[PDB]
């Protein structure tokens, strides 16, 4: 009776986003935090109307082939409202109010915690009305700390875990396939039935 609580239903790590770095030829790599990314956690968070949770973010950065050389890396959390960095050596990296994490490739993966950062009392993704740009959750830039330009292409994996999650106003589970990222657009034609067909109604197929 403990594996059925909402906290246990949501609290578990798992891939939430793949970021590609090149360091040629843009140098840096941004990533907007959204939990609606994959179609596996989107189906679990569209089951509830309101949610409230803290997040644990884990950064696992590998190289192209796989070998890890000891280079410094800067991760930068951009809170909602702050401007995103525009270049590899812009002034948004040196801003003291953007919390940064300095970690090497040979070190264990990075791990940070992000609290509830919405001006309302809980997150919501189904917003029936017109302004939902209310829950931005931040941004996560990453670059290679170095004076000159390095010659490696990296590959970062952001694993998200949810903690202290509370849910309100449950709603049914979506059966139709997805078409967009921010809209529940289904297809009018080719509506998939929620139950596989059988031969007759008087059987046990």
């Amino acid at each position: 009776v403990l594996e059925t609580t909402i906290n246990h239903f949501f609290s578990r790590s798992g891939l939430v986003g793949v970021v590609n770095l090149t360091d040629g030829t843009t140098g840096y790599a941004t990533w907007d935090i959204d939990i609606m990314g994959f179609v596996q956690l989107r189906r679990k968070c569209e089951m509830f109307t309101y949610m409230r949770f803290n997040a644990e973010f884990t950064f696992v950065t590998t190289t192209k082939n796989g070998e890890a050389r000891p280079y410094m890396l800067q991760y930068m959390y951009v809170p909602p409202g702050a401007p995103k960095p525009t270049g590899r050596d812009a002034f948004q990296w040196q801003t003291a109010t953007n919390p940064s994490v300095f970690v090497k490739l040979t070190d264990p993966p990075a791990q940070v915690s992000v609290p509830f950062m919405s001006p309302a009392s809980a997150y919501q993704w189904f917003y029936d009305g017109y302004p939902c740009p209310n829950n931005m959750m931040g941004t996560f830039a990453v670059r290679v700390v170095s004076r000159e330009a390095s010659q490696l292409k990296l590959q970062t994996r952001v694993y998200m875990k949810l903690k202290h999650v509370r849910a309100w106003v449950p709603r049914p589970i979506r059966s139709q396939p997805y078409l967009l990222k921010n809209f529940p657009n289904y297809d009018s034609s080719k509506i998939t039935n929620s139950a596989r067909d059988r031969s007759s109604i008087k059987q046990a197929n």
Binding site: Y130, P172, L180, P184, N185
Partner: protein
């Protein structure tokens, strides 16, 4: 009669003006004509009564709004008709767009007359997916009643204020939607009335208005 209280909570005040005289009256909408080939109807509530009398005047010229509702859906048919309706309230009922396009600037989106129907409601196009990509077979998770034409003819739903913020605009944000769907279609012998009415009355319980911007 059997009264369904939405989520087991009574609508209460904020722990703003309180009319208490001309806003606690039964706004009766026009009757919808349910037939054999009908699909269903839905209403968005904080914009269903934005053009009707005292509530519409006090909700258009204000800026903050908070109220619950008391819904009464009568469905008066004869003793020879048969069928069944499902009447249910849905918090944050987002109307989906029907299309097969994956480009964000080319995919279809519902118009203003589809998302916000007004005091005349709107009809479903695909009631099997609630026009939201979500099946109505499990739409019984919401506060709901059945109107079975062999048992009763009326339904009543007292719904509180369901929102993440204590105050919100009554024009640019519909709080929840009402949906009536004929799960079992209407049947009748020859010579009877070929279309039966559905009447809806609304009582704005515990209304609060703020920011008199005229």
């Amino acid at each position: 009669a059997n009264i369904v209280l939405a989520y087991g909570e009574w609508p209460e005040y904020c722990p703003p003006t309180r009319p208490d005289v001309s806003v606690n009256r039964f706004y009766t909408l026009d009757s919808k004509m349910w037939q054999e080939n009908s699909t269903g109807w839905y209403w968005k509530f904080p914009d269903v009564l934005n053009k009707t009398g005292v509530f519409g005047q006090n909700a258009q010229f204000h800026y903050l709004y908070r109220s619950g509702f008391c819904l009464h859906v009568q469905c008066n048919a004869s003793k020879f008709h048969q069928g069944a309706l499902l009447v249910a309230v849905i918090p944050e009922f987002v109307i989906a767009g029907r299309g097969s396009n994956t480009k964000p600037n080319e995919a279809p989106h519902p118009g203003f007359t589809t998302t916000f129907p007004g005091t005349t409601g709107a009809t479903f196009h695909d009631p099997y997916v609630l026009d939201s990509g979500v099946p109505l077979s499990q739409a019984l998770i919401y506060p709901h009643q059945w109107i079975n034409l062999r048992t009763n003819n009326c339904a009543t739903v007292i719904v509180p204020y369901i929102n993440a913020v204590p105050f919100d605009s009554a024009i640019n944000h519909s709080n929840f939607g009402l949906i009536v769907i004929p799960v079992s279609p209407l049947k009748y012998s020859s010579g009877a009335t070929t279309a039966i009415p559905i009447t809806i009355t609304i009582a704005p319980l515990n209304s609060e208005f703020g920011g008199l911007r005229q």
